[PDB]
Design a protein around this ligand. Structure first.
Ligand SMILES: [Zn+2]
Ligand SMILES: [Zn+2]
Ligand SMILES: [Zn+2]
Ligand SMILES: [Zn+2]
Ligand SMILES: [Zn+2]
Lengths: 445, 417, 292, 196, 355
């Protein structure tokens, strides 16, 4: 939902603020990268002719088989205020955002970029030895800090405050310690560009006027940037948060020349295997992977034995399972990790068993779990045996009369999100004590 | 045998047989001959491979096998009889067939008969079981014991034949008729019982040998050489293929139903290399939005045309009345049958085919008029609401039919006129 | 969905380009085409982050692996453009200038055979190489200058058919861009129709940016939900071997299998020398027998 | 036991009759059965009338079930007097001579499989006591008799026989035998010069 | 030391393919695959059982045969319980036989075989077949014996007289009668009674059987054949088809009698003439124009180039992996050699080199 989250945020961004974002070619290039294929095709077609089109021509062009996907593309196109659809001459006359159009055109032609792709110094050096090494160092420090295994190099105070305020890896002030939230484990499960995008979305949400569009344009060009060169130190708000993301280890800055590491490239785009684990009914771990980070994250939910070159061995204990459970870490998160860490031989065996059971019966009279339930459902049985109850606390309305209070005001209560529970035949439904915003108002009628 | 075109056309019973097998074949044949009165020989003349396939499917038969060996004795016993295996027993043992046919249609029942048969010692004798006086057998079935014995004698008499001297062990043992040595061992000679009589293992072994001989002479039914026999192929020349290679002479005709100069292309080449080293601008590629608008018009026109092509991407769903749909499909089918037979007559090319061609031409004309009258029916049934679609659906076969009529008329004017 | 391995073959030949620009007046039209293709590869590599591009040019005497550089430094283009786009465009303009300098050097010898089929085959081999490495969409692009003299497509026909069969095995559409006086190129049109490719012929070098940006953008990620824009239809017929005209109903050898619109002279095969049967050919020559 | 009923389902079974004429008809039946390929089995005594001039080849000689040691009848006074006389004459060990006659009869039984070099066959020894007799056995016979083969069971006998059939079901390049097994006239000339 | 074994194995392999010939090979084919479904193929001895793998391999065989040679008709008759059962008439549509084989999937193989009955009705099915069509039968077999009603030798003589060949792919080992069939039918050749050694070998054998076979000089049938290219229409209205008698949006149109059909390469149902496309006839031109093998140059000698001519990659360096097309005098890598020799059917070095 990364593109969904960013698109949602930009839809939250108003129309003229969006148009301000559509001014510069680097921002337009990054946003074009965000757009789905259909809308990407539409804008690359229309960008080289100043002919507005009606919707009817596009509809006649569009094959109706993917019409839902077309609707999604144009819904994003309109809701981002990237389109100006007006019903001119009775027809919904389709118009791209013109600033976006011309900035995309200049980016494609290599025309006027105003160094939106970057105020270049072009003093290239080696990046694998300084930039990549410092980047790996700083990211290792922040990563083990997020893990909770002890490490001396604490992060910045800005990100420390952002973690304190945010629900990510809770620095619980009563305990004085960063603590793994379920959101923290979601961040741990996240892909690296997902983690970066969540971090920048949270930082953009917390940061206020520091010009928001300056941060937006700078973020987009920073994603647009390339590795291993010096560049001019631009807006000053951009410069100071550039120093901030220098302290994050994103850029290797020599206090004016700065050298962006590979993290900008991964932020822009992604780039018996490694990370593939053989499950065991004896809960033994046969990982085809090793890192001290791997051991650090496996310490949270796996009882391990020793570290060898790719062979990380161990045995999953129920103590490890319940250690994961008691942190608020979801068993769905656990199986997210597990099903992202499967192995070729065992998944081939699972697919062979699935194709064997397909011909016998469609249901098979077996629980729906594709990963082999000899080991996988043992956690899933422990997953179901973990939660296994439903608790309702607070207020409760009871002993109703007839279903005019259910199909008219409790069926409507599904549309507004105020009930915690719904039982028509019991003539009772449960709400939270604090969730009495619009519950004791229309139920009286 | 039953393999000629005449034989396959003659077998009316087989024709009725696969008729009754199919259902659309009653539909087609009924319309063809019951309704249209086509010569049914010419009806079946197309379906000759189908007729022969049906005949050969019905015609095969299995090979012999040791049905008594496959019989198992299986507390109590329940008869689980298979009629094909019962007839297999009948064919393998005409004595058992005779014992069935003189007792069951005269005295008692079939399952009772087979219970008596399984009880009988004659069954044990015919199977691989040594007879025993402790066994009582069935008296009714075991009355046939001496009859089966004289059957065995007659069959052995039939099975006797002269032997090749190349393998004749009788000639081998008749090498020296005055061999005077010692009496051979009891161990290696055929042993007997205490009272000098045999146990009968020689009888059961010669019996199973008789079974083998009977099987191989059943194979040897209606349905010098030692030079070839003693060839030593291992020291002979290897066989080499006489397959012919093929070459290919290559001389193809040019495609049937201003010239540039080296100086001018060299001048242009020099100029364009000059332009190439001179300059190259990506930004000038942007068009003038007017000729580009004509490009938009051309592209969109192509999209509209090919989209209308793609708009018409079990048969198709139709809003026809189902009875009229079936009737028009039937008429289309019989018209296609008529057309194919008319083409068969026409492409045959004989003066003997002339009256056939004329009569099928008349039938095609009749089909045309019946199509028109059907069009009148859907005319006054729809007010041409979808009678137009009816006419268009029946159109192309009508066009091909009337094209064939024009071809027939043209060739009539070519030859006669 | 997946990175589409882009396959672009450019048929460069002065015998065609000189003919086209002398027929018209747009000198540097090939340069315009090259710039348009530069923008096309930019649009493609901006459509997906890894949809890698194979660029090969076939000159008069052979072919050349343009992109990338071989397994064994001026900058005409601007420094403000993208890094990967700039790298590819600089590499291609350097390779193009090197090939054109070479073509100027060895201009004076004569080779009358088109190398389009060989270029297509080598590109298909490289498609196999890329797809076997590491899942990648295969889409093949040909750029030709059709204004030159249509000399002999007969020897080109057979390997073109072989390439069609191979791409059919490889699920690669063969999309054809033609610029020339002749509206139709029958073998290319048949190639597009069989391989589910796209045929297009125009004349003006202007507007090809809009042309092949709009039409020539169909990827296998979204092929079934895009109608093909081709309007021509092909009978998939061939000209006769000894009369050179296309045949609807005719005769072929039982051995050589070449089309014979008429009876061969001497009743022997004009391709593989097979003498045929006189009664057979008399039955073929038989008129229908008609009643008087 | 009715085992022969099971045997019926695969091949015919032919037994040496005491009548040589019926035996001749039986062997003709076996010949024709292997000719049509439906398959048959012969049952003949080791010293029986078949064993002294009838060969079997390329479908007839394919596999032989020799049953145990074909020892003579032990309690013959005639045999014992022979043993005494031959021992008195040439100092012959009696049991050794008995083993001699047994193995020579076994060799006569097993020698009727390989007519040409193109043929192939498999030999069995269905007695425990045969293992000490490879030194007795003829040299070319025993040269194929490997040391692992000296004591086998039914299971690896079956496996090896199936693999042998798989092996003999393959063609062979003539180059591998053009100068070492099959000799041309020039090959014989070259060999003769090499001897020279 | 594995490379020396690989080299000598490649030498012993290439000794068979040293001789490459432009024999006249049959194009108008007539292929029959009979199936036995008996007690023998119930053995699970090969995984999962012989019946399942011959079903799967027959699916593949149908696909490959129709792809390579679409100018033939395919008939399948099963053998079961002492009866040979026709399940697939000869047809141009492979999908019919695919559905029939799918029916054969769920049913249970049982019984005993009868090659006499099987080959007799195969002969009868092959009886109404035109002269140019090459009648040939593939037979799979798992038994070591055959129960039959009568003589096989009369059938052998009749099959030889009616110019039909056979090729037997036996399962367990050689059967002498099948060897006799292959030899006598095949002019004394022994290159037709083939026994697999594993399932991979069975796959290779099926792929070998896919290919067209050469014909004999004495078996001369050199003639012409009438042919007609039809025309495809794309109409707005659905139209009744001649073959299946149902409404069709498109469909080819008959070149002669102007009827319409539903599939190609098929014969007309109305003017009764065969209709194809030029692609279909050119499909076998690699068989018509074979490709010479490419020779690795030795590692000792001086090298024309050190990287691959075609795929454009560096040649690896003990021995030299530079497969040279002597027809174009260019060396290539093993990957390109494989692709040009199997997938492609032209040499781009010979395409660039002018003649
Ligand atoms: Zn020919
Ligand atoms: Zn149809
Ligand atoms: Zn026709
Ligand atoms: Zn290569
Ligand atoms: Zn070559």
């Amino acid at each position: 939902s990364l593109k969904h989250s960013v698109t949602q945020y930009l839809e939250e961004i108003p129309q003229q603020v969006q148009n301000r974002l559509y001014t510069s070619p680097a921002t337009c290039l990054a946003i074009y990268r965000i757009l789905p294929p259909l809308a990407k095709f539409f804008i690359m077609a229309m960008v080289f002719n100043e002919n507005e089109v009606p919707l009817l021509d596009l509809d006649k062009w569009v094959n109706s088989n993917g019409k839902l996907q077309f609707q999604n593309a144009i819904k994003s196109m309109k809701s981002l205020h990237l389109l100006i659809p007006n019903k001119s001459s009775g027809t919904l006359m389709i118009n791209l955002n013109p600033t976006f159009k011309i900035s995309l055109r200049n980016a494609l032609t290599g025309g006027e970029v105003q160094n939106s792709f970057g105020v270049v110094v072009e003093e290239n050096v080696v990046s694998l030895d300084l930039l990549d090494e410092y980047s790996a160092n700083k990211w290792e420090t922040i990563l083990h800090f997020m893990v909770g295994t002890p490490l001396a190099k604490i992060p910045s105070e800005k990100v420390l405050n952002l973690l304190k305020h945010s629900k990510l890896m809770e620095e619980v002030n009563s305990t004085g310690e960063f603590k793994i939230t379920n959101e923290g484990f979601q961040f741990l499960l996240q892909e690296i560009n997902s983690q970066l995008w969540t971090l920048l979305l949270q930082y953009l949400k917390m940061i206020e006027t520091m010009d928001l569009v300056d941060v937006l344009h700078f973020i987009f060009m920073l994603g647009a940037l390339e590795v291993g060169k010096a560049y001019k130190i631009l807006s000053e708000t951009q410069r100071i948060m550039l120093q901030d993301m220098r302290d994050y280890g994103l850029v290797f800055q020599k206090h004016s020349i700065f050298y962006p590491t590979k993290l900008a490239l991964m932020l822009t785009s992604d780039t018996i295997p490694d990370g593939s684990l053989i499950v065991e009914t004896n809960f033994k771990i046969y990982s085809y992977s090793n890192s001290p980070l791997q051991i650090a994250v496996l310490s949270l939910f796996v009882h391990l034995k020793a570290r060898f070159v790719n062979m990380v061995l161990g045995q999953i204990t129920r103590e490890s399972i319940r250690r994961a459970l008691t942190n608020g870490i979801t068993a769905d998160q656990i199986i997210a990790y597990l099903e992202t860490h499967a192995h070729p031989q065992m998944r081939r065996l699972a697919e062979e068993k699935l194709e064997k059971k397909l011909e016998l019966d469609p249901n098979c009279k077996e629980p729906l779990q594709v990963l082999p339930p000899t080991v996988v459902d043992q956690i899933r049985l422990w997953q179901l045996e973990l939660d296994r109850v439903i608790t309702y606390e607070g207020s409760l309305y009871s002993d109703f009369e007839t279903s005019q209070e259910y199909n008219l005001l409790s069926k409507y209560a599904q549309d507004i999100g105020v009930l915690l529970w719904k039982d028509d035949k019991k003539k009772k439904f449960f709400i939270s004590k604090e969730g009495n915003s619009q519950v004791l108002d229309f139920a009286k009628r | 045998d039953s393999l000629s075109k005449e034989k396959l056309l003659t077998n009316l019973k087989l024709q009725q047989s696969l008729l009754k097998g199919n259902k659309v074949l009653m539909k087609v044949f009924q319309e063809t001959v019951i309704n249209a009165g086509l010569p049914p020989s010419e009806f079946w003349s197309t379906r000759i491979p189908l007729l022969r396939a049906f005949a050969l499917s019905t015609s095969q038969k299995v090979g012999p096998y040791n049905v008594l060996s496959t019989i198992k004795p299986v507390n109590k016993v329940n008869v689980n009889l298979s009629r094909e295996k019962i007839l297999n027993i009948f064919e393998n043992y005409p004595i058992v067939k005779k014992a069935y046919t003189d007792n069951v249609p005269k005295n008692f029942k079939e399952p009772e008969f087979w219970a008596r048969f399984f009880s009988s010692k004659l069954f044990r004798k015919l199977r691989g079981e040594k007879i025993m006086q402790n066994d009582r057998g069935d008296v009714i079935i075991d009355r046939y014991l001496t009859l089966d014995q004289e059957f065995d004698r007659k069959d052995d008499d039939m099975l006797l034949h002269p032997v090749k001297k190349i393998i004749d062990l009788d000639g081998n043992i008749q090498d020296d008729p005055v061999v005077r040595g010692n009496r051979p061992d009891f161990t290696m000679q055929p042993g007997v019982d205490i009272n000098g009589n045999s146990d009968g293992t020689v009888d059961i072994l010669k019996g199973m040998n008789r079974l083998s001989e009977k099987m191989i002479m059943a194979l040897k039914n209606e349905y010098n050489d030692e030079r070839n026999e003693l060839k030593i192929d291992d020291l002979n020349e290897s066989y080499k293929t006489n397959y012919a290679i093929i070459h290919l002479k290559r001389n193809a005709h040019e495609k049937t139903t201003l010239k540039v100069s080296n100086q001018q292309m060299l001048q242009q080449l020099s100029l364009v290399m000059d332009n190439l080293i001179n300059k190259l601008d990506l930004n000038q590629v942007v068009p003038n939005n007017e000729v580009s608008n004509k490009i938009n018009k051309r592209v969109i026109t192509a999209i509209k045309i090919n989209a209308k092509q793609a708009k018409h991407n079990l048969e198709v769903k139709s809003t026809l009345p189902i009875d009229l749909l079936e009737s028009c499909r039937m008429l289309h089918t019989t018209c296609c049958e008529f057309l194919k037979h008319f083409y068969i007559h026409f492409q045959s090319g004989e003066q003997k085919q002339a009256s056939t061609v004329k009569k099928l031409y008349n039938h095609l004309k009749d089909c045309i008029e019946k199509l028109n009258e059907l069009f009148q029916d859907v005319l006054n049934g729809d007010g041409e609401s979808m009678s137009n679609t009816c006419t268009a659906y029946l159109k192309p076969v009508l066009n091909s039919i009337t094209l064939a009529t024009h071809k027939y008329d043209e060739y009539f004017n070519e030859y006669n006129n | 969905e997946s990175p589409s391995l882009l396959t672009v073959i450019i048929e460069i030949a002065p015998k065609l380009w000189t003919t086209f620009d002398e027929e018209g007046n747009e000198k540097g039209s090939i340069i315009k085409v090259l710039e348009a293709l530069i923008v096309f590869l930019n649009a493609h590599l901006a459509f997906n982050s890894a949809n890698k591009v194979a660029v090969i040019a076939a000159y008069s005497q052979g072919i050349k692996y343009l992109y990338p550089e071989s397994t064994s430094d001026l900058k005409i283009i601007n420094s403000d453009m993208y890094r990967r786009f700039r790298n590819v465009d600089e590499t291609l303009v350097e390779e193009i200038y090197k090939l054109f300098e070479l073509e100027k050097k060895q201009i004076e010898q004569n080779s009358q055979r088109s190398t389009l089929a060989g270029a297509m085959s080598a590109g298909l081999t490289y498609v196999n190489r890329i797809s076997k490495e590491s899942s990648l969409k295969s889409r093949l692009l040909v750029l030709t200058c059709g204004s030159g003299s249509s000399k002999d497509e007969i020897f080109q026909y057979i390997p073109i058919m072989n390439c069609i069969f191979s791409a059919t095995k490889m699920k690669c559409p063969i999309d054809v861009v033609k610029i020339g006086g002749s509206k139709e190129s029958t073998f290319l049109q048949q190639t597009t129709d069989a391989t589910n490719g796209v045929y297009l012929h125009v004349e003006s070098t202007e507007g090809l940016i809009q042309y092949l940006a709009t039409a020539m953008f169909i990827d296998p990620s979204l092929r079934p939900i895009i109608v093909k824009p081709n309007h021509g239809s092909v009978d998939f017929r061939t000209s006769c071997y000894l009369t050179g005209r296309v045949v609807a109903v005719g005769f072929i050898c039982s051995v050589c299998l070449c089309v014979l619109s008429i009876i061969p002279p001497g009743n022997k095969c004009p391709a593989c020398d097979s003498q045929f049967d006189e009664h057979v050919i008399a039955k073929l020559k038989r008129k229908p027998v008609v009643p008087r | 036991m009715g085992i022969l009923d099971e045997v019926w389902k695969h091949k015919l079974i032919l037994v040496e009759t005491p009548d040589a004429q019926e035996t001749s008809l039986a062997l003709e039946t076996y010949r024709k059965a292997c000719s049509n390929g439906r398959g048959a089995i012969l049952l003949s005594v080791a010293r029986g009338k078949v064993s002294e001039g009838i060969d079997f080849d390329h479908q007839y000689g394919r596999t032989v079930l020799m049953i145990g040691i074909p020892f003579q009848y032990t309690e013959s006074r005639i045999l014992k007097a022979r043993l005494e006389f031959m021992r008195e004459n040439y100092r012959i060990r009696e049991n050794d001579f008995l083993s001699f006659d047994a193995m020579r009869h076994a060799a006569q039984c097993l020698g009727r499989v390989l007519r040409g070099k193109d043929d192939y066959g498999v030999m069995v020894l269905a007695d425990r006591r045969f293992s000490r007799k490879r030194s007795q056995l003829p040299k070319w016979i025993a040269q194929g008799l490997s040391d692992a083969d000296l004591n086998l069971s039914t299971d690896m006998a079956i496996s090896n026989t199936k693999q042998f059939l798989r092996t003999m079901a393959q063609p062979t390049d003539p180059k591998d035998q053009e100068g070492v097994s099959v000799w041309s006239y020039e090959d014989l000339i070259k060999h003769q010069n090499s001897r020279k | 030391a594995s490379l020396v074994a690989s080299i000598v194995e490649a030498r012993k392999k290439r000794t068979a393919k040293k001789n490459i010939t432009p024999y006249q090979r049959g194009i108008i084919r007539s292929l029959i695959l009979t199936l036995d479904c008996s007690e023998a193929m119930l053995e699970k001895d090969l995984r999962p059982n012989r019946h399942a793998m011959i079903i799967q391999y027959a699916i593949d065989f149908v696909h490959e045969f129709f792809d390579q040679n679409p100018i033939s008709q395919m008939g399948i008759i099963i053998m079961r319980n002492g009866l040979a059962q026709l399940v697939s008439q000869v047809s141009g549509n492979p999908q019919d036989h695919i559905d029939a084989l799918k029916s054969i999937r769920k049913q249970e193989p049982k019984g005993n075989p009868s090659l006499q009955n099987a080959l007799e009705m195969a002969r009868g099915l092959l009886l109404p077949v035109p002269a140019h069509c090459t009648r040939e039968v593939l037979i799979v077999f798992g038994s070591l014996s055959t129960t039959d009603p009568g003589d096989i030798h009369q059938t052998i003589d009749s099959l030889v007289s009616e110019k039909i060949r056979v090729k037997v792919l036996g399962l367990s080992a050689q059967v002498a009668i099948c060897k006799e069939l292959c030899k006598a039918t095949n002019y004394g050749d022994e290159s037709f009674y083939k026994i697999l050694l594993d399932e991979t070998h069975l796959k290779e054998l099926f792929n070998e059987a896919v290919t067209p076979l050469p014909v004999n000089k004495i078996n001369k049938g050199f003639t012409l054949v009438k042919m007609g290219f039809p025309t495809r229409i794309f109409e707005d209205t659905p139209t009744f088809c001649s073959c299946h008698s149902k409404l069709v949006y498109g469909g080819y149109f008959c070149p002669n009698c102007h009827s319409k059909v539903c599939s190609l390469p098929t014969v007309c149902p109305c003017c009764d003439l065969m209709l194809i496309l030029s692609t279909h006839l050119a499909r076998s031109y690699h068989h018509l124009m074979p490709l010479k093998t490419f020779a690795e140059v030795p590692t000792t000698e001086k090298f024309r180039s050190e990287d691959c001519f075609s795929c454009q990659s560096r040649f690896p360096i003990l021995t030299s992996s530079r497969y040279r097309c002597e027809d174009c005098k260019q060396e290539f890598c093993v990957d390109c050699d494989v692709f040009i020799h199997e997938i492609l059917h032209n040499c781009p070095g010979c395409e660039s080199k002018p003649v």
